[PDB]
Design an enzyme around this catalytic site. Sequence first.
Site, PDB file in Angstrom:
ATOM      1  CD  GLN A  80      -9.415  -9.180 -16.921  1.00 48.13           C
ATOM      2  OE1 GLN A  80      -8.722  -8.231 -17.245  1.00 48.13           O
ATOM      3  NE2 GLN A  80      -9.364  -9.723 -15.711  1.00 48.13           N
TER       4      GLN A  80
ATOM      5  N   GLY B  42      -8.399  -6.306   4.539  1.00 54.72           N
ATOM      6  CA  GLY B  42      -9.577  -6.129   3.707  1.00 54.72           C
ATOM      7  C   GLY B  42      -9.167  -5.644   2.323  1.00 54.72           C
TER       8      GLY B  42
ATOM      9  CG  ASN C  39      -5.096  -3.574 -14.896  1.00 51.75           C
ATOM     10  OD1 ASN C  39      -5.015  -3.790 -13.680  1.00 51.75           O
ATOM     11  ND2 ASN C  39      -6.121  -3.992 -15.634  1.00 51.75           N
TER      12      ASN C  39
ATOM     13  N   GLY D 288     -10.777  -5.253 -11.523  1.00 50.31           N
ATOM     14  CA  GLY D 288     -10.703  -5.837 -10.197  1.00 50.31           C
ATOM     15  C   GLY D 288     -10.977  -7.330 -10.122  1.00 50.31           C
ATOM     16  CD  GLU D 289     -11.183 -12.408 -13.748  1.00 56.23           C
ATOM     17  OE1 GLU D 289     -11.197 -11.737 -14.798  1.00 56.23           O
ATOM     18  OE2 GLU D 289     -11.216 -13.657 -13.749  1.00 56.23           O
ATOM     19  NE  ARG D 290      -3.513 -10.398  -9.427  1.00 57.76           N
ATOM     20  CZ  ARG D 290      -2.912  -9.990  -8.307  1.00 57.76           C
ATOM     21  NH1 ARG D 290      -2.973  -8.730  -7.882  1.00 57.76           N
ATOM     22  NH2 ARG D 290      -2.219 -10.873  -7.612  1.00 57.76           N
TER      23      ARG D 290
ATOM     24  CB  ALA E 145       4.678   4.646 -10.852  1.00 60.93           C
TER      25      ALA E 145
HETATM   26  N1  CDP Z   1      -5.621  -5.878   0.384  1.00 63.65           N
HETATM   27  C1  CDP Z   1      -5.605  -5.206  -0.891  1.00 63.65           C
HETATM   28  C2  CDP Z   1      -4.450  -5.431  -1.795  1.00 63.65           C
HETATM   29  C3  CDP Z   1      -4.407  -4.757  -3.113  1.00 63.65           C
HETATM   30  N2  CDP Z   1      -5.490  -3.880  -3.487  1.00 63.65           N
HETATM   31  C4  CDP Z   1      -5.529  -3.220  -4.738  1.00 63.65           C
HETATM   32  O1  CDP Z   1      -6.065  -4.051  -5.618  1.00 63.65           O
HETATM   33  C5  CDP Z   1      -5.427  -3.754  -6.959  1.00 63.65           C
HETATM   34  C6  CDP Z   1      -4.806  -4.871  -7.527  1.00 63.65           C
HETATM   35  O2  CDP Z   1      -4.555  -4.549  -8.874  1.00 63.65           O
HETATM   36  P1  CDP Z   1      -4.445  -5.737  -9.993  1.00 63.65           P
HETATM   37  O3  CDP Z   1      -4.417  -5.134 -11.378  1.00 63.65           O
HETATM   38  O4  CDP Z   1      -3.176  -6.519  -9.724  1.00 63.65           O
HETATM   39  O5  CDP Z   1      -5.692  -6.780  -9.812  1.00 63.65           O
HETATM   40  P2  CDP Z   1      -7.283  -6.458 -10.031  1.00 63.65           P
HETATM   41  O6  CDP Z   1      -7.960  -6.579  -8.689  1.00 63.65           O
HETATM   42  O7  CDP Z   1      -7.478  -5.066 -10.608  1.00 63.65           O
HETATM   43  O8  CDP Z   1      -7.821  -7.481 -10.994  1.00 63.65           O
HETATM   44  C7  CDP Z   1      -4.367  -2.588  -6.610  1.00 63.65           C
HETATM   45  O9  CDP Z   1      -5.042  -1.271  -6.881  1.00 63.65           O
HETATM   46  C8  CDP Z   1      -4.096  -2.746  -5.402  1.00 63.65           C
HETATM   47  O10 CDP Z   1      -3.711  -1.486  -4.746  1.00 63.65           O
HETATM   48  C9  CDP Z   1      -6.653  -3.662  -2.592  1.00 63.65           C
HETATM   49  O11 CDP Z   1      -7.532  -2.942  -2.953  1.00 63.65           O
HETATM   50  N3  CDP Z   1      -6.696  -4.334  -1.272  1.00 63.65           N
HETATM   51  N1  CDP Z   2      -7.384   7.773 -14.482  1.00 65.54           N
HETATM   52  C1  CDP Z   2      -6.863   6.930 -13.443  1.00 65.54           C
HETATM   53  C2  CDP Z   2      -5.535   6.288 -13.637  1.00 65.54           C
HETATM   54  C3  CDP Z   2      -4.981   5.417 -12.578  1.00 65.54           C
HETATM   55  N2  CDP Z   2      -5.762   5.189 -11.381  1.00 65.54           N
HETATM   56  C4  CDP Z   2      -5.288   4.392 -10.319  1.00 65.54           C
HETATM   57  O1  CDP Z   2      -4.454   5.129  -9.617  1.00 65.54           O
HETATM   58  C5  CDP Z   2      -3.434   4.162  -9.059  1.00 65.54           C
HETATM   59  C6  CDP Z   2      -2.138   4.583  -9.332  1.00 65.54           C
HETATM   60  O2  CDP Z   2      -1.331   3.917  -8.391  1.00 65.54           O
HETATM   61  P1  CDP Z   2       0.152   4.540  -8.078  1.00 65.54           P
HETATM   62  O3  CDP Z   2       0.779   3.663  -7.021  1.00 65.54           O
HETATM   63  O4  CDP Z   2       1.004   4.597  -9.316  1.00 65.54           O
HETATM   64  O5  CDP Z   2      -0.007   6.101  -7.611  1.00 65.54           O
HETATM   65  P2  CDP Z   2      -0.825   6.591  -6.296  1.00 65.54           P
HETATM   66  O6  CDP Z   2      -1.988   7.446  -6.747  1.00 65.54           O
HETATM   67  O7  CDP Z   2      -1.347   5.452  -5.454  1.00 65.54           O
HETATM   68  O8  CDP Z   2       0.162   7.391  -5.480  1.00 65.54           O
HETATM   69  C7  CDP Z   2      -3.831   2.751  -9.746  1.00 65.54           C
HETATM   70  O9  CDP Z   2      -4.632   2.041  -8.685  1.00 65.54           O
HETATM   71  C8  CDP Z   2      -4.484   3.025 -10.769  1.00 65.54           C
HETATM   72  O10 CDP Z   2      -5.492   1.998 -11.096  1.00 65.54           O
HETATM   73  C9  CDP Z   2      -7.076   5.844 -11.186  1.00 65.54           C
HETATM   74  O11 CDP Z   2      -7.682   5.657 -10.183  1.00 65.54           O
HETATM   75  N3  CDP Z   2      -7.630   6.714 -12.247  1.00 65.54           N
HETATM   76 MG    MG Z   3      -6.269  -4.343 -12.184  1.00 64.93          MG
END
Ligand code: CDP
Ligand code: CDP
Ligand code: MG
Lengths: 193, 194
Positions: free
Chosen positions: B16, B37, B91, B56-58, B95
Amino acid sequence: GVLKLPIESIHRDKDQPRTYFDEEKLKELSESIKAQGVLQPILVRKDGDGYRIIAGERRWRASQAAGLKEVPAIVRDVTEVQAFELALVENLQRADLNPIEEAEGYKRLVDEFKLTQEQVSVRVGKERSTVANALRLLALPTDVKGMVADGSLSMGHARALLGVPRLPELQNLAKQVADKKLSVRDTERLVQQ
Amino acid sequence: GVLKLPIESIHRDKDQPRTYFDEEKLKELSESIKAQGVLQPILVRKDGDGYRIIAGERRWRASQAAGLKEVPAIVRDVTEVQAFELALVENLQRADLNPIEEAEGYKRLVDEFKLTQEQVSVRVGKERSTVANALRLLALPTDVKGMVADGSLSMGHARALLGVPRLPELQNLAKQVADKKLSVRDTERLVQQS
Ligand SMILES: Nc1ccn([C@@H]2O[C@H](COP(=O)(O)OP(=O)(O)O)[C@@H](O)[C@H]2O)c(=O)n1
Ligand SMILES: Nc1ccn([C@@H]2O[C@H](COP(=O)(O)OP(=O)(O)O)[C@@H](O)[C@H]2O)c(=O)n1
Ligand SMILES: [Mg+2]
Ligand SMILES: [Mg+2]
């Protein structure tokens, strides 16, 4: 679980935490949606004649801009204090890829999966100039890439340092720029030699 | 749609795009998950006798650290190439809120919804120092927090400028620092003289 909701059934939260919507970034998001669809459902609340966005206004706007008629969504039954907490958590609990991780991602698509740089740009929704500049970072030596990766050197700093003819001279200049913490303008004046 | 998958049935993608995992940020994510959650389901691929993570590994690591036994997931039937594209898109197509938007968000939870600053930290999963420092930004003048909002002034630049006693001089240093792109250390020396 995940409904497909008509975009017209969804309206923005006028009190949501984001007030600035960068149009250039919205354009990239829309391009990525054309290529991949929306990967993560937006969070909405039943409200009025439809739904109010909890988190996901950019996705909703970008989908509208791409001409999609529906957006994947999760309907949450929450108070509006909790809905506001969800909007903050969704945006604030993230960690971006660093510039080297991003560049190496493009490189894998090209080298391993046999995409062109054009195809990478289309498939990920990033500007051709962004893909090309990230790949150019990978011509830097390890030490220098490490400083880009950990933020010791910015994109702009790395830009200028690509002009240095000699790699050994390139590292020492790069280490001074990061170590003394010079401006981008000072770096370019230094690179002129 | 969204499945509840057992965490033990999900394994990471060793190829990844992310290679660095900040421990403090994983801690914050885990605390947010304890409070709220997992808000956004992770993307997984059928792999071996379980599932491989696409994106979503984190969330998956933090859920384990939070003591959850399952995680919301979307199962995608994709090629290996498309899965890697999805990981990059998830990722790179985001914004962030700017520092002022973040600070005003904490302030709304306090002033409008009547949380304590302590509760803001718990419910959003951010360290107490982070919430406090963000709120301190809102004492800056409009024009200055606009420069913070658009990135003209960094976080450290703002921190130093809070030490200026008089607003007219704070604004003038703010313009000077941002227009000349002075360093944080240089900005600090200016502030002490003032
Ligand atoms: N309690 C939470 C906190 C963050 N998030 C989301 O988990 C994602 C974290 O993005 P990331 O790229 O830092 O880590 P990954 O889980 O994708 O590996 C974001 O879309 C956050 O909005 C969530 O689903 N539930
Ligand atoms: N083609 C895409 C591009 C981004 N995304 C996700 O859409 C989110 C964009 O977050 P953001 O804070 O910039 O904008 P919002 O849609 O939450 O208002 C991220 O969680 C991205 O992983 C998606 O679901 N599908
Ligand atoms: Mg991510
Ligand atoms: Mg968001």
